[PDB]
Amino acid sequence: DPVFVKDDDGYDLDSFMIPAHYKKYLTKVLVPNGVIKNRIEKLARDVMKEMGGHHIVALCVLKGGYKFFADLLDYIKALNRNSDRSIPMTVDFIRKVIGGDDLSTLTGKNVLIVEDIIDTGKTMQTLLSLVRQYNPKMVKVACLFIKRTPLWNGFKADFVGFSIPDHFVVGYSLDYNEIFRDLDHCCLVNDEGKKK
Amino acid sequence: AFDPVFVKDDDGYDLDSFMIPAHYKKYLTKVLVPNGVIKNRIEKLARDVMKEMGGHHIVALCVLKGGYKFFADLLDYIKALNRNSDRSIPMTVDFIRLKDIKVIGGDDLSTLTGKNVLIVEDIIDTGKTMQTLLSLVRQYNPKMVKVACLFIKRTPLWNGFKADFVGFSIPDHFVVGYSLDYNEIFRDLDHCCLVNDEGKKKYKA
């Protein structure tokens, strides 16, 4: 079960380390880097408890969100090397696979579809359908954030970090732009910053 | 800017949200503040400290109440900033115990004159200790006296003392984890948590 970030839940800009020039473009901090890190650690723990019995192949959906992947994989790897028996762990990236083809390599394996933010479910549901055609041992979906969109027209994921309100978020590496490249915390944007 | 992060009475996280050793969960109800938020805040407090006192010799007076995790962390962040600045300043560490009152280290209250002294404590509840120390340090005319603290509890027993650099404002519930002493029973606990009636029963004596 995800961490529930309430609508008006959040933090002041001066509460944590944020570079001075970004402050002009931000409303508040939703989730600090440290909470993200801590939650990703548990997600990784949850993944290994459920999938760690067999070869895991992580499929990262490239949306311009490298930071979550890096941290998630790191904790997965750390748990893999700290467990008594080591397990094969393959990581591929989807745009079509960058690795990658054929997807026949997915058969008999434990597949983890990794997305950093789920908005509608569309992108995920397509891959869920796609990978199931290749008969994997199991399919699970990992995600840092799910936006509580009223228009949530999809599924509930297996491993989810935070449940957040349907606002535009930047920081960490969530924003596809490289304009908040130095912002480590998940922050929602004001009117001046949403330009863009 | 210096205002502490407010942790509302009903704020917190489920015990399954983060990584907690399985045996501890019996004695806990909720996570109040996760290790990562604590660290993030401490980092800001260090910047704050340095913004105000980084101009001259800092003596950090650490008040002996159980562990020293907070002191060590705060100072490590401060030390990092002191290396990466144009003019590095001297820094001294001293431990202090209330009774009354004697300084453990190279300094004495009397040798604090002309220095930026930072009084560091884990948690302020009543505010009595800090006020006493503030008055003790001020007698020896230091360049400045500032008070840094990780937590402040909201209690009607609070004396009105306002510390300079406080991390979190927390409810009047007894908390364990991170640096908070529980007679070292929650020594492998990284997150600040609330103890249940069963856990409080396990503390005695």
Side-chain angles (χ1 to χ4, degrees), chain B residues 15-46 48-85 88-98 101-137 139-161 163-181 183 185-195:
Chain B
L15 302 171
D16 293 331
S17 288
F18 302 108
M19 208 87 158
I20 303 163
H23 44 265
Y24 291 148
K25 287 183 188 179
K26 311 159 190 171
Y27 311 107
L28 311 166
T29 40
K30 271 201 170 191
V31 172
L32 235 220
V33 190
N35 193 257
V37 199
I38 298 160
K39 277 177 170 168
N40 280 6
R41 223 334 211 193
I42 295 166
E43 197 192 335
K44 217 323 182 92
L45 294 183
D48 292 353
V49 160
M50 220 55 183
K51 196 214 161 192
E52 296 281 288
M53 320 183 230
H56 191 74
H57 197 162
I58 297 170
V59 182
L61 253 51
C62 303
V63 185
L64 281 162
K65 283 172 178 187
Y68 37 78
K69 264 193 186 170
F70 174 53
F71 306 138
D73 286 354
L74 214 214
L75 265 36
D76 279 355
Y77 285 111
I78 293 161
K79 279 207 281 278
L81 292 159
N82 199 30
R83 275 147 191 71
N84 298 106
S85 61
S88 297
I89 51 156
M91 220 196 79
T92 312
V93 180
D94 294 285
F95 285 90
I96 185 272
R97 192 81 197 189
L98 68 143
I101 285 94
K102 206 159 81 176
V103 175
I104 301 166
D107 282 298
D108 287 322
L109 288 177
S110 66
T111 65
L112 295 178
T113 313
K115 291 166 187 162
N116 297 337
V117 28
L118 178 67
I119 299 164
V120 195
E121 187 179 38
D122 289 317
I123 185 161
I124 300 165
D125 46 343
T126 59
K128 278 202 290 185
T129 322
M130 296 302 90
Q131 208 182 71
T132 302
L133 259 184
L134 209 287
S135 288
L136 258 309
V137 178
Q139 287 174 231
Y140 302 99
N141 193 240
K143 206 208 206 322
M144 67 180 76
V145 210
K146 251 67 186 171
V147 184
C149 189
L150 221 196
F151 306 107
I152 45 161
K153 274 186 175 170
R154 307 175 218 109
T155 333
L157 262 56
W158 174 51
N159 73 341
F161 180 85
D164 302 281
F165 316 104
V166 43
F168 302 93
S169 169
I170 59 158
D172 195 31
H173 312 123
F174 185 81
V175 290
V176 294
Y178 183 61
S179 76
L180 303 117
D181 172 54
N183 284 8
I185 185 163
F186 291 103
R187 58 187 173 272
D188 297 348
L189 185 60
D190 296 334
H191 317 293
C192 179
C193 303
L194 305 170
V195 219

Side-chain angles (χ1 to χ4, degrees), chain A residues 100-121 123 125-152 154-155 157-167:
Chain A
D101 303 338
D102 202 359
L103 288 162
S104 61
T105 54
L106 269 55
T107 192
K109 312 270 176 68
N110 292 344
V111 180
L112 181 64
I113 300 160
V114 184
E115 198 178 328
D116 58 358
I117 206 284
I118 293 168
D119 199 312
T120 55
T123 57
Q125 288 283 295
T126 314
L127 311 163
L128 273 162
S129 175
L130 221 177
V131 299
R132 274 169 191 172
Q133 294 174 43
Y134 285 100
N135 294 319
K137 269 203 82 160
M138 71 181 78
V139 199
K140 266 92 172 68
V141 177
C143 195
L144 221 184
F145 300 100
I146 55 156
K147 286 186 185 189
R148 293 197 231 91
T149 323
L151 287 88
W152 154 63
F155 78 133
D158 306 292
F159 309 102
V160 37
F162 300 90
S163 169
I164 54 161
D166 191 29
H167 288 309

